[PDB]
Design an enzyme around this catalytic site. Structure first.
Site, PDB file in Angstrom:
ATOM      1  N   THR A 185      -0.113  -9.344   6.692  1.00  0.00           N
ATOM      2  CA  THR A 185      -1.232 -10.170   6.267  1.00  0.00           C
ATOM      3  C   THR A 185      -2.253 -10.272   7.400  1.00  0.00           C
ATOM      4  OG1 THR A 185       0.052 -12.196   6.775  1.00  0.00           O
ATOM      5  CG2 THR A 185      -0.002 -11.461   4.468  1.00  0.00           C
ATOM      6  N   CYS A 231      -0.855 -20.365  -0.208  1.00  0.00           N
ATOM      7  CA  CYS A 231      -0.175 -19.781   0.940  1.00  0.00           C
ATOM      8  C   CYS A 231       0.520 -20.809   1.820  1.00  0.00           C
ATOM      9  CB  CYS A 231      -1.184 -19.003   1.777  1.00  0.00           C
ATOM     10  SG  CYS A 231      -0.495 -18.265   3.254  1.00  0.00           S
ATOM     11  N   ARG A 282       0.850  -1.198   0.000  1.00  0.00           N
ATOM     12  CA  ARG A 282       0.000   0.000   0.000  1.00  0.00           C
ATOM     13  C   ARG A 282       0.892   1.257   0.000  1.00  0.00           C
ATOM     14  NH1 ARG A 282      -1.630  -3.422   3.560  1.00  0.00           N
ATOM     15  NH2 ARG A 282      -0.483  -2.190   5.133  1.00  0.00           N
TER      16      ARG A 282
END
Ligand code: HEM
Ligand SMILES: CC1(C)[C@@H]2CC[C@@]1(C)C(=O)C2
Ligand SMILES: [K+]
Length: 404
Positions: free
Chosen positions: A242, A347, A176
């Site tokens: 995360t 993942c 971000r």
């Protein structure tokens, strides 16, 4: 807005901005879900962030993640410069090469390590929550969402907690970006941090995750220093950005839904199922692939080198996958999602993530069963490769709490 490429037909244009979507104030998942409205094709082109495809439906997202021959992980981030700089292992690799590295990453974040860390994880959750309990309020993102996962990661990696602000800054620039750093600058700063540490731990091997990666083997041969660095960087990003974000989405939801809190208090054995349904509804990751060759995909002509965002977030929010997808139902019979990815890159941290989530729900609801969003607060989300919550002020009556 990037000029529309001649190969992209004008009718497939939907100018969605993954880093600042238009409907953001409605919530980030809601903002992304605009791509799933009835008038939107299964596969669209956005002229934002340099121009790229977006698969909008679970069927297409899954199909593309399975087909690494056409959809390569070599360039998995948007914008192109980020994707091109991106060289983390295993994520920037396709099979066959990628696979050997998964086994090594599993030695440090897989089920065996999760079992090792479970005591400390439980301990830290209990400690953080008990300290907050008598206060009747907290800033959840700062007071719990960040320290709980991050302090455990730092412990696992044998890194001092004093380094958290620096590393969290860098990891946030890769997911971000605030504009101060390009992805490449942030990645190189992360590598700059890791290089001396990796050398140290190859000379004097220890027990920490960096040591284990740096001295590890991949399909029976030694890992290189370069490969170690590229794997360790990825583990740091996963550890710091995360679960940290997901915890806040989940707690925001619980704060706004007394009936769902009641459900888990009454029947705590439902917590794992709740975790799964929250992972579907507040799914938060969106990366993608690059076209290896010209390819016709679901009636659409894709060109070699085209980037395609395949938002993991979107599969489980697809009404075709899950009826009433915006509704949270802990009893949902078939919880369909790709929150932790799909295909060969599934993942590796998911077992750690689920434990952190389940421990949080359990230990929070035991001690602070009743809580709400602070009066008058408006919760603001943020969007990117990993989406998140800017701040989450919570309040409760200490007289409704219980010290364990
Ligand atoms: C809610 C928490 C998490 C979510 C939703 C999540 C999501 C994902 C997704 C979608 C991918 C696939 C990316 C792709 O195909 O390009 C992935 C891969 C990966 N994740 Fe997680 N992740 C989470 C937590 C973690 C944690 C805590 C770690 C610990 C470091 C971690 C480590 C990794 C690694 C190493 C990969 C790469 C596997 C590969 O490329 O073969 N993840 N994650
Ligand atoms: C997309 C991810 C969540 C996955 C693990 C960290 C992350 C940002 C990556 O670069 C791969
Ligand atoms: K790359």
């Amino acid at each position: 807005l990037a000029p529309l490429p001649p190969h992209v037909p004008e009718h497939l244009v939907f100018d969605f901005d993954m880093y600042n979507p238009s409907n953001l104030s409605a919530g980030v998942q809601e903002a992304w879900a605009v791509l799933q409205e009835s008038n939107v094709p299964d596969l669209v082109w956005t002229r934002c962030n340099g121009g790229h495809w977006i698969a909008t439906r679970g069927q297409l997202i899954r199909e593309a993640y399975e087909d690494y021959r056409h959809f390569s992980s070599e360039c998995p981030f948007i914008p192109r410069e980020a994707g091109e700089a991106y060289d983390f292992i295993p994520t920037s690799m396709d099979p066959p090469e990628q696979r050997q590295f998964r086994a090594l990453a599993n030695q440090v974040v897989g089920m065996p390590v999760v079992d090792k860390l479970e005591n400390r994880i439980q301990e830290l959750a209990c400690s953080l929550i008990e300290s907050l309990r008598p206060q009747g309020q907290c800033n959840f993102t700062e007071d719990y969402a960040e320290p709980f996962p991050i302090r455990i990661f730092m412990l696992l990696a044998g890194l001092p907690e004093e380094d958290i602000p620096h590393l969290k800054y860098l990891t946030d620039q890769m997911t971000r970006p605030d504009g101060s750093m390009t992805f490449a600058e942030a990645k190189e700063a992360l590598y700059d941090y890791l290089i001396p540490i990796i050398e140290q731990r190859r000379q004097k091997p220890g027990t920490d995750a960096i040591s284990i990666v740096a001295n590890g083997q991949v399909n029976g041969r030694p890992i290189t220093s370069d490969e170690a660095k590229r794997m360790c960087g990825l583990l740091l990003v996963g550890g710091l950005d995360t679960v940290v974000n997901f915890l806040s989405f989940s707690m925001e939801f619980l704060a706004k839904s007394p009936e769902h809190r009641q459900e888990l208090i009454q029947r705590p054995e439902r917590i794992p199922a709740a975790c799964e349904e929250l992972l579907r509804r507040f799914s938060l990751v969106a990366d993608g692939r690059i076209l290896t060759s010209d390819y016709e995909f679901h009636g659409v002509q894709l060109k070699k080198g085209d980037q395609i965002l395949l938002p993991q977030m979107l599969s489980g929010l697809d009404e075709r996958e899950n009826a009433c997808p915006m509704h949270v139902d802990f009893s949902r019979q078939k919880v369909s999602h790709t929150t932790f990815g799909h295909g060969s890159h599934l993942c590796l941290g998911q077992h750690l993530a689920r434990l952190q989530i389940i421990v949080t729900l359990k230990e929070w609801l035991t001690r602070i069963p009743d809580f709400s969003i602070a009066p008058g607060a408006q919760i603001q989300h943020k969007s990117g490769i990993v989406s998140g919550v800017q701040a989450l002020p919570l309040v409760w009556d200490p007289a409704t709490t219980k010290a364990v």
